[PDB]
């Protein structure tokens, strides 16, 4: 990041840190009205929270935001999208977490039975090495050509 | 857009309705 | 909730294993249709070579049949299936086991429903097992032109291979066009033709080909009764079929003339969805019997029509219409899309929106 960008992120971090604890809690993120309606907010917070303590410190915050820099690469953006699904952070999308993340996104536009069936079929058709889970490589083989990385950029 | 959506002589004739 | 184990455990996980030839053909080379049925109902697949053997052995039986089959009563006559495999399973329960029931299907096995290849495999295996008691006609969807535009080709490439699709297409070319049933009924998918005046005109066609864009083979597969059938102000026997974009509408006078000339009681056909699963059309004045009957065997068509399906069981000089409701089937996203392709656009959209609002 640029100097002026590093300065703007500090100011913004402090404004979100309602209790001036030096770390951002889920409640503090959820104080933003636009985020209350977004079903992936907890997933993004969890990815930023690389030390697993439940909150986003400033270092976690800058590292998180830099994934969405215009200077980032396809692999980096696609890796972030992968991590949205990979709840348990082992590097493989498994059946249970794929259902849970999709259910977050679709809510009641699908019944649990219909969603579980299409999750099963994607696990089966996209798993190439038989370990029953989707690696980042297996993931990119499916979606890498959709160019969603082009849309995952923010101005800091 | 808050939630993901799914994309877009003579024979007699008798009737046995659905069970 | 576990991130690895499955959330909705009451849904059985589909089998990944592909059945082999020894698993699918018994000690005499006969298909084990009970094995096949149970596996296909679980969305199980076959080894490619086994799928090709079913398709080609079935084609071989069809290839030795006449353009116009001669089928004695008793028989259960069925209309469109359109890939609705789980409704086909109910169909056999309602009409009776092929082990002791003679069957005639009027075509349209594939497209629209997402279990078209399972329909083909299971019906072809039954044809192999019951070569002289279960009969299959060609519908307008059993061709390359429609299956590449609708989803059957894509379905084959997702579940099997294009090689299996290609085998189906050559098999479909062998399907007979018509049946003369109990020497009383001409049975076809679509209907009549300007160029078909007698049954012998059907016997003279060359059917081993892709259906042409016009002509008698085309008309048998594609034609419809007039919208105002039996209520004609339309004085012409045949008019251009503006719904289909090919072939013709036929009128009630046209049908009654054909029946009288050829000493037939009625035409049995499919091809048009019906709310009740069937339609009985205006009686011929010379017979006192419906001149035309539509049978449609795909309940809750396209998962939205909310129609009943029917089959016609013709036995003991009774024409018994048996209706049935739709049955549950496993879910597929449209066009066999996987859940990553489906959801990733929304993921990219919403994580970017969060970040924009976080940074404001
Ligand atoms: Ca705080
Ligand atoms: Ca942390
Ligand atoms: Ca994982
Ligand atoms: Ca794998
Ligand atoms: Fe049809
Ligand atoms: Na082909
Ligand atoms: Zn049709």
Numbering used by the authors:
A (entry chain B): 15 to 170
B (entry chain C): 681 to 688, 713 to 723
C (entry chain A): 11 to 370
Give the exact sentences the study uses for this entry.
The plasma membrane Na+/H+ exchanger 1 (NHE1, SLC9A1) is a central regulator of cellular pH and volume, and thus is important for cell proliferation, survival, and motility in mammalian tissues. NHE1 comprises a 12 transmembrane-helix domain that mediates Na+/H+ exchange and a C-terminal intracellular domain that is heavily phosphorylated and functions as a protein:protein interaction hub. Recently, it was shown that CN recruits regulators, inhibitors, and substrates using two short linear motifs (SLiMs), the PxIxIT and the LxVP motifs. We show that the two canonical CN-specific SLiMs, a previously identified PxIxIT motif and a newly discovered LxVP motif, contribute to NHE1 binding of CN.
